[PDB]
Curated annotation (Swiss-Prot), chain B:
Ubiquitinated by NEDD4L; promotes internalization. The ubiquitinylated form is internalized through a clathrin-mediated endocytosis by interacting with AP2M1 and is recycled back to the cell membrane via RAB4A and RAB11A. Changing A18T: In LQT1; decreased potassium channel activity. Changing S20P: In LQT1; decreased potassium channel activity; decreased CALM binding in the presence or not of calcium. The gene is KCNQ1. Each channel subunit contains six transmembrane segments (S1-S6) with S1-S4 forming one voltage sensing domain (VSD) and S5-S6 contributing to form one quarter of an interlocking pore-forming domain (PD). The segment S6 is involved in the inhibition of voltage-gated potassium channel activity by KCNE4. Changing W39R: In LQT1; decreased potassium channel activity; decreased CALM binding in the presence or not of calcium. This is Potassium voltage-gated channel subfamily KQT member 1.
UniProtKB/Swiss-Prot annotation, chain C:
The modification N6-acetyllysine is found at K17, K90. Transmembrane segments: none annotated. Changing N93S: In CPVT4; the mutant has significantly reduced calcium affinity compared to wild-type; calmodulin-RYR2 interaction is defective at low intracellular Ca(2+) concentrations and restored at moderate to high Ca(2+) concentrations; increased RYR2 calcium-release channel activity; decreased KCNN2 calcium-activated potassium channel activity; not changed KCNN2 expression; not changed KCNN2 location at membrane. It comes from Homo sapiens. This is Calmodulin-1. Changing N49I: In CPVT4; increased RYR2 calcium-release channel activity; not changed calcium-dependent inactivation of L-type calcium channel; not changed protein abundance; not changed structure; not changed thermal stability both in the absence and presence of calcium; no effect on the calcium binding affinity; significantly increased binding of RYR2; increased ryanodine-sensitive calcium-release channel activity; decreased of KCNN2 calcium-activated potassium channel activity; not changed KCNN2 expression; not changed KCNN2 location at membrane. Residues 72-143 are annotated as: Necessary and sufficient for interaction with PCP4. Homotetramer. Interacts with MYO1C, MYO5A and RRAD. Interacts with MYO10. Interacts with CEP97, CCP110, TTN/titin and SRY. Interacts with USP6; the interaction is calcium dependent. Interacts with CDK5RAP2. Interacts with SCN5A. Interacts with RYR1. Interacts with FCHO1. Interacts with MIP in a 1:2 stoichiometry; the interaction with the cytoplasmic domains from two MIP subunits promotes MIP water channel closure. Interacts with ORAI1; this may play a role in the regulation of ORAI1-mediated calcium transport. Interacts with IQCF1. Interacts with SYT7. The modification Phosphoserine is found at S77, S97. There is a cross-link at K17 (Glycyl lysine isopeptide (Lys-Gly) (interchain with G-Cter in ubiquitin)).
Swiss-Prot record, chain D:
Ubiquitination results in a strongly decreased activity. Phosphorylation results in a decreased activity. There is a cross-link at K19 (Glycyl lysine isopeptide (Lys-Gly) (interchain with G-Cter in ubiquitin)). The modification Phosphoserine is found at S79, S99. Keywords: Acetylation, Calcium, Cell projection, Cilium, Cytoplasm, Cytoskeleton, Disease variant, Flagellum, Host-virus interaction, Isopeptide bond, Long QT syndrome, Metal-binding, Methylation, Phosphoprotein, Repeat, Ubl conjugation. Homotetramer. Interacts with MYO1C, MYO5A and RRAD. Interacts with MYO10. Interacts with CEP97, CCP110, TTN/titin and SRY. Interacts with USP6; the interaction is calcium dependent. Interacts with CDK5RAP2. Interacts with SCN5A. Interacts with RYR1. Interacts with FCHO1. Interacts with MIP in a 1:2 stoichiometry; the interaction with the cytoplasmic domains from two MIP subunits promotes MIP water channel closure. Interacts with ORAI1; this may play a role in the regulation of ORAI1-mediated calcium transport. Interacts with IQCF1. Interacts with SYT7. This is Calmodulin-1. (Microbial infection) Inactivated by S.flexneri OspC1 and OspC3 proteins, which specifically bind the apo-form of calmodulin, thereby preventing calcium-binding and activity. The gene is CALM1. The modification N6,N6,N6-trimethyllysine is found at K113.
Amino acid sequence: HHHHHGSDYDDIFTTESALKVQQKQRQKHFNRQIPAAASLIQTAWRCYAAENPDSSTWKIYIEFSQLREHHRATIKVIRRMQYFVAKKKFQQARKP
Amino acid sequence: KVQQKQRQKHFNRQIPAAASLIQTAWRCYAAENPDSSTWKIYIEFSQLREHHRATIKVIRRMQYFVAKKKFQQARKP
Amino acid sequence: TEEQIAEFKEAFSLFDKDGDGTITTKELGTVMRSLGQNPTEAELQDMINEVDADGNGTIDFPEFLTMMARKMKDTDSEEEIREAFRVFDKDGNGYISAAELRHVMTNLGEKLTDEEVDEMIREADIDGDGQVNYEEFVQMMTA
Amino acid sequence: QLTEEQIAEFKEAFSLFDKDGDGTITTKELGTVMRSLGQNPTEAELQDMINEVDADGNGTIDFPEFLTMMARKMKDTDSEEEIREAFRVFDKDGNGYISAAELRHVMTNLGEKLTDEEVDEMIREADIDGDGQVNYEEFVQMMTA
Ligand SMILES: [Ca+2]
Ligand SMILES: [Ca+2]
Ligand SMILES: [Ca+2]
Ligand SMILES: [Ca+2]
């Protein structure tokens, strides 16, 4: 439990494969960046596109596009029936 | 020409009929156009849409902020 | 055509939850009630009687196809629409008042929402000062 | 930045995730909405999502925490430069341009995997081509306005 300056130059440490193998550390590090950068671009754009109500990033939701396509289909059919009824009833109304 | 009451009541039934023909014809025309909304007359489904898009917009930005933070860590040595 | 036959087959199934290949009034009434509408047995009878051609009271798939394939954009029926417009036109020529249109569209027949007749009126883009020429409209509906 | 029914808007949005009425959004609450329609988030991902919103660290979100997140913004800030350097990762040449076909790859085959039709939208919003060019600096300030 003491300490004083020893002043000895020669070294028998045999010390310096951590040089080009610490490379690996900074390749793993860049390898992490690729998924992260791709995700940032994707999530940013999907926030942009989402503000556009018709621009189809909404088609990625299958059930609801389904549901809309079924919704519109029912309406068109009904509306055409109502038309043909309104059509016949009008020429009834006109014939003396 | 007393039989005008019959001829007028005859016309009286033509007015609702004409109005309906115009309305049913246009609603077929408006229907082929998917955004142009005669579809806003369907309340619960329009609400269902707004509820749908609301949920997405919220979700999509939680994912943004997560993607945001995860990128900042990926950049930091 | 390929596209649309498949489309019609799917639309038919939307009204026929039964899978039996028939569409009854209660089937049709259910679809319209699900869409927030309140039709009556008469109106449903009328709708079906205009489609059902064999008089059995219900609609099959061939009968359904015939109505979907039915003409609408035709030489004969845009003249049927034009004279419906002529009913409301008193003067004699070809304009109906812009204010008058909103009145009859919103307050008569099937009625109509103000946003819907806004779409009509901006689909218009005609005004002497406030006047819509109706034959242009019928030819818009008929292209 | 704040109006009348911007607030009523968010109050309803909060209630869409909270079927509880308790004023709380849990992972099961969030997981259900995503699983409702229509994707498959693991039991992970959800905590991350919530931990980025939850600021008092009790594992769930209340309405003020929900407000803070949408008070938060993308275009009004710098983070345009955060997106930019995410683009620089893929640009090898050093020029401000990334290949049109390369963008197709990274948007569809990496990360959250966008659809083909989605990147078409990106590419038509692009309107940039020498070979095909896509200066990602204009894409950045397109998203941020
Ligand atoms: Ca049946
Ligand atoms: Ca039949
Ligand atoms: Ca709750
Ligand atoms: Ca909390």
